C-alpha cells in the first residue's frame, strides 16, 4: 500500500497498528501478529489401551 | 489416513473421525451417510405387504431438579458483626437474590404435579389375571417387594448413581 | 386391540385369525426390553447429565470463598483480630466487592437452566395426553411406525415410556391398473387397489394381502371409457343372476 | 481481518455437500415410495396412483383426479415456475436468516472496541504503564483495567447464553415440521401451509 | 491468580454452546436409514421435477 509524505503510521477497522513506514529509509512495512491457537487430546478411553 | 469410510463415535471436524480398531492403533477417515440403496419403479408396478411384527422402543424425558437455598448475609458476611455493617450501604441485593431462588422451589413441584396428575378417582386391577393369552408381569405392582414397585421401575431405581 | 387395528387400516379379521402367533411376539418382545437396560450405562445418560451439571456449580461457590481478592488474607477472622478499626475498612470491602460477583453469576446460570427443565416437563405432559390416554394419528411422535399404545412408568426425575408398533415385514411384487370398465362403463374400488396375480385380478386392501372376486359391492360405477388412460379389459360378477334362474 | 486478539471460530463438522446428500435422499424416497418409507421398508408405486390417495384423504373421490389428469399436471408445473422468479423481489424473503448474521457481528465488534477505554487509569496500553511507572505504584492502575474487562466479558458471554434458547426452540419446531409435513400427511389446520395439505 | 476461576468458568460455558450447534443440525436432516436414489428414466405421467 502507498501512504502521505506526511503519514507515518496505519490502521485498521477495530484500530489496531499494522503498517510502520521505515525512519531510516522512508519505507514501508506490515506487522501481523505470528501462530498461537490450542491444543487437544484424543483418546480412547483409559481402560481400553 | 486411509482410504474406507465408517461411522461416527469421536467427531474432529469438517467429516473426519477417529476411532480405536485391530495391530492396535488409531485411524482417521471420514465419515459415511449410510448403505447406499436403489428402488425399483415403473408405471404399473406396485408392492404389497405380505407379514407384520410388533416392535417396543423407549423413551428417557427429564422433569424436575433439586432445590436449593442460600442465605446471603451467612455466605458473604460469617458471624461477626463489624462485617455485618457494611453491608447495609448496599441496598437491596440480598432481599433480590432470595426471591430469585425460592421462586424456582415453588415451581418445580409444580412441574412434578403437572405430568402425573391426570386422573380423578384410583383404580385397582382385577384380582383374576385373564386377558386372552397377554402377559403383563413386567409392568404390575409385585405385592412382594416392600415397595410397590414393578419390577422394570426398580431396576431403573438402582441404575441412576446420586457432601 | 381389534379397534386399534380398525383405526390404522387393516379390518378386524386380521387381529383374531392370528391371535396366538401376535401374542407370543409381544410378550417375548417385553423380554428385551429389561435385558437392553443391563448394558453400560449409557441408556440413562440424559437423566444423569441434569444431576452432574448442578453439582458442578455448587463445588465452584464454595472454592472461591479461599481467594484473597486482592486482600492480605482470606480469613475475616485474622483481619478482625490484626488490624485496628480504622484500617480494617480498606481491606474489608475488597473482600465483599468480590464475593458479590461470584453469588450473582451463580444465580444467573440457575435461572437459565431451569428455562430448559420447565420447556422439557411440557412435552411430557403433551405425550402422556396422547400417546397413553389415546391413539395418534401424528408421524414419528409415539414411536417410529404406526401407534398401537402406551405405557408410562417412574423414574427419579423424570419418566420413562414404552411404545407399541406395527410394522410390515415381507413383501412382493404386482401388476395394477387405474380402472377398469366392462358395459361400457368405468369402474373404480372402494377401499382397495386392482392386483393382477397373473392371470386373473383381483380386489386386496393396500396395508395386508387378501384377493378378493371383483363383485358389485366393492366397486362404484362412473362415466364411460376412453377417458381414463390406463384403463383395462376384464368382467364383473354381479351376484343376482344365480338366483332368477 | 488479521485474526485480531485471541479469536477463533471452528468449523462444522457436517460439510455443505453432506447436507446436500440428506436432501436429496428425502426427495427421492418421497416420489418413489411415498409416504412408506417413513415408517418400515419402501414400497413402490406409481405417481399418479400416490396423488388419488390424497385427495382420497382430503374428502374428495378419486374419480376427480383421473378425469381431469391433464389439467391438474400443468397447474402445478406454472405455480413452481412463479417461485423462482419471485425469489428474486426485494431481499424481504431472505431477512430471517440474514439478522441473525448481522447480529453476531454487532456482538463481536463491540467486544474488541472495548480494549481502548482508560477505564479511570493514566493511559489504555499495558506496556505504557509498565515503562513509564515503578512497580510498586504500578499494581493500582493495572488492577483497574483487569476489572474493568472482566465486566465487558461476562456481559458478551451472558448475551450468547439467552441467544442461543430461541435457536433452540426453532430447531425444534423444524424436526417436528418434517416429521409431519413433509414424511406425510396432516390434519391440522395451517400448520403445513394455508389450506388443505 | 488472585481472582480463583473465573477464567475457568467463561470457558465451560462458550464450548457448551459450540457442541449444541452439532446436535441441532444432525436432528433435523439425519432421519433416514438409507439413501435412496432417483430412476434414470423421468416419466411420473405428465409432472415436470
Ligand atoms: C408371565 O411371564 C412371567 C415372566 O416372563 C412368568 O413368570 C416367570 O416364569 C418363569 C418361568 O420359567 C419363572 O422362572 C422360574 O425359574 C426358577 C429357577 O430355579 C424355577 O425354579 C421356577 O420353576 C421358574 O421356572 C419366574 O420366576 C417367573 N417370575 C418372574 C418374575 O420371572 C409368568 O409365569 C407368566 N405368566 C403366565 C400366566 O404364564
Ligand atoms: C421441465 O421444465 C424445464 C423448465 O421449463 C424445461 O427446460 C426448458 O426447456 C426448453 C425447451 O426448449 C428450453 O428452451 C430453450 O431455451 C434456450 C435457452 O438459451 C433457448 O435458446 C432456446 O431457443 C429454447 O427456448 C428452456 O431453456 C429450458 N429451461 C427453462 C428454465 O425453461 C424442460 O424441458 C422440462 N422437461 C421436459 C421433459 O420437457
Ligand atoms: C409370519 O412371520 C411369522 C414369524 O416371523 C411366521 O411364524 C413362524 O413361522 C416359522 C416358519 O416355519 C415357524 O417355524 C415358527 O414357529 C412360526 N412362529 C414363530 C413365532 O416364529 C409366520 O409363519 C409368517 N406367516 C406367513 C404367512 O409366512
Ligand atoms: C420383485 O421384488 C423383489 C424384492 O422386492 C425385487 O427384485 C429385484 O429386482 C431388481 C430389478 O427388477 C433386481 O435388480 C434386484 O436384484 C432384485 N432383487 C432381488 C432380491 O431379487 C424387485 O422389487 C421386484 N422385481 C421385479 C422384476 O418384479
Ligand atoms: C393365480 O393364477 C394361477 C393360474 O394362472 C392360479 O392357479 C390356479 O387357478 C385356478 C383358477 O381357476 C384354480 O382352479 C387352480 O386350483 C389354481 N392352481 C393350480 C395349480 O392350477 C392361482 O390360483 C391364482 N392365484 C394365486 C394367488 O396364485
Ligand atoms: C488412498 O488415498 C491416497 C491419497 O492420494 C492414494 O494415494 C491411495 O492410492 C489410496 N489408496 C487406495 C487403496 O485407494
Ligand atoms: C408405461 O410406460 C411405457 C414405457 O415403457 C409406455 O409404453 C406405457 O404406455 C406406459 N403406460 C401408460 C399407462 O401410459
Ligand atoms: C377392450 O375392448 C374394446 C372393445 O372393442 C377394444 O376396442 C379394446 O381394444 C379392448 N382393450 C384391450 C386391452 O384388449
Not at chain 2, 440480598?94 to 380423578?120: P, Y
Not at chain 3, 390404522?8 to 386380521?14: A, R, S
Not at chain 3, 396375480?197 to 362412473?222: A, C, K, L, M
Amino acid at each position: 500500500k502507498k501512504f502521505l509524505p506526511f503519514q507515518q503510521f496505519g490502521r485498521d477497522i477495530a484500530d489496531t497498528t499494522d503498517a510502520v513506514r521505515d525512519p531510516q529509509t522512508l519505507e514501508i512495512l506490515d506487522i501481523t501478529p505470528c501462530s498461537f491457537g490450542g491444543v487437544s487430546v484424543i483418546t480412547p478411553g483409559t481402560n481400553t489401551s | 489416513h486411509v482410504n474406507n469410510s465408517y461411522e461416527c463415535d469421536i467427531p474432529i471436524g469438517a467429516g473426519i473421525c477417529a476411532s480405536y480398531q485391530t495391530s492396535q492403533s488409531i485411524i482417521a477417515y471420514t465419515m459415511s451417510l449410510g448403505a447406499e440403496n436403489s428402488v425399483a419403479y415403473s408405471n404399473n408396478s406396485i408392492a404389497i405387504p405380505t407379514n407384520f411384527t410388533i416392535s417396543v422402543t423407549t423413551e428417557i424425558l427429564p422433569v424436575s431438579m433439586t432445590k436449593t437455598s442460600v442465605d446471603c448475609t451467612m455466605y458473604i458476611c460469617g458471624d461477626s458483626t463489624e462485617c455485618s455493617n457494611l453491608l447495609l450501604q448496599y441496598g437491596s441485593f440480598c432481599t433480590q437474590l432470595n426471591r430469585a431462588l425460592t421462586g424456582i422451589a415453588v415451581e418445580q413441584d409444580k412441574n412434578t404435579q403437572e405430568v402425573f396428575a391426570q386422573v380423578k378417582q384410583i383404580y385397582k386391577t382385577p384380582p383374576i389375571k385373564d386377558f386372552g393369552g397377554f402377559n403383563f408381569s413386567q409392568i404390575l405392582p409385585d405385592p412382594s417387594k416392600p415397595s410397590k414397585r414393578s419390577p422394570i421401575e426398580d431396576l431403573l431405581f438402582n441404575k441412576v448413581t446420586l457432601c | 386391540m381389534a379397534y386399534r387395528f380398525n383405526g390404522i387400516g387393516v379390518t378386524q379379521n386380521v387381529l383374531y385369525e392370528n391371535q396366538k402367533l401376535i401374542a407370543n411376539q409381544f410378550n417375548s418382545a417385553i423380554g428385551k426390553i429389561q435385558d437392553s437396560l443391563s448394558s453400560t450405562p449409557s441408556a440413562l445418560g440424559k437423566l444423569q447429565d441434569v444431576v452432574n451439571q448442578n453439582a458442578q456449580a455448587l463445588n465452584t461457590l464454595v472454592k472461591q470463598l479461599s481467594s484473597n481478592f486482592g486482600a492480605i488474607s482470606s480469613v475475616l477472622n485474622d483481619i478482625l483480630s490484626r488490624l485496628d478499626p480504622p484500617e480494617a475498612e480498606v481491606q474489608i470491602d475488597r473482600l465483599i466487592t468480590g464475593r458479590l460477583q461470584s453469588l450473582q453469576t451463580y444465580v444467573t446460570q440457575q435461572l437459565i437452566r431451569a428455562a430448559e427443565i420447565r420447556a422439557s416437563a411440557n412435552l411430557a405432559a403433551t405425550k402422556m395426553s396422547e400417546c397413553v390416554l389415546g391413539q395418534s394419528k401424528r408421524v414419528d411422535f409415539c414411536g417410529k411406525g404406526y401407534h398401537l399404545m402406551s405405557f408410562p412408568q417412574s423414574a427419579p426425575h423424570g419418566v420413562v415410556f414404552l411404545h407399541v408398533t406395527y410394522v410390515p415385514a415381507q413383501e412382493k411384487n404386482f401388476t395394477t391398473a387405474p380402472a377398469i370398465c366392462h358395459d361400457g362403463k368405468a369402474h373404480f374400488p372402494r377401499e382397495g387397489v386392482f392386483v393382477s396375480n397373473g392371470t386373473h385380478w383381483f380386489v386386496t386392501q393396500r396395508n395386508f394381502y387378501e384377493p378378493q372376486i371383483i363383485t358389485t359391492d366393492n366397486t362404484f360405477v362412473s362415466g364411460n371409457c376412453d377417458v381414463v388412460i390406463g384403463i383395462v379389459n376384464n368382467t364383473v360378477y354381479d351376484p343376482l343372476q344365480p338366483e332368477l334362474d | 481481518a488479521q485474526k485480531f486478539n485471541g479469536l477463533t471460530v471452528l468449523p462444522p463438522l457436517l460439510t455443505d455437500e453432506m447436507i446436500a446428500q440428506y436432501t436429496s435422499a428425502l426427495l427421492a424416497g418421497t416420489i418413489t415410495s411415498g409416504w412408506t418409507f417413513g415408517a418400515g421398508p419402501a414400497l413402490q408405486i406409481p405417481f399418479p396412483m400416490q396423488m388419488a390417495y390424497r385427495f382420497n384423504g382430503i374428502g374428495v373421490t378419486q374419480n376427480v383426479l383421473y378425469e381431469n389428469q391433464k389439467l391438474i399436471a400443468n397447474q402445478f408445473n406454472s405455480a413452481i415456475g412463479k417461485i423462482q422468479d419471485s425469489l428474486s423481489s426485494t431481499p424481504s424473503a431472505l431477512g430471517k436468516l440474514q439478522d441473525v448474521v448481522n447480529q453476531n457481528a454487532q456482538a463481536l465488534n463491540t467486544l474488541v472496541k472495548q480494549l481502548s477505554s482508560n477505564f479511570g487509569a493514566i493511559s489504555s496500553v499495558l506496556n505504557d504503564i509498565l515503562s513509564r511507572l515503578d512497580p510498586p505504584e504500578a499494581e493500582v492502575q493495572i488492577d483497574r483495567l483487569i476489572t474493568g474487562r472482566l465486566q465487558s466479558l461476562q456481559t458478551y458471554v451472558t448475551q450468547q447464553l439467552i441467544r442461543a434458547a430461541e435457536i433452540r426452540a426453532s430447531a425444534n419446531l423444524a424436526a417436528t415440521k418434517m416429521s409431519e409435513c413433509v414424511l406425510g400427511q396432516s390434519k391440522r389446520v395451517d400448520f403445513c401451509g394455508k389450506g388443505y395439505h
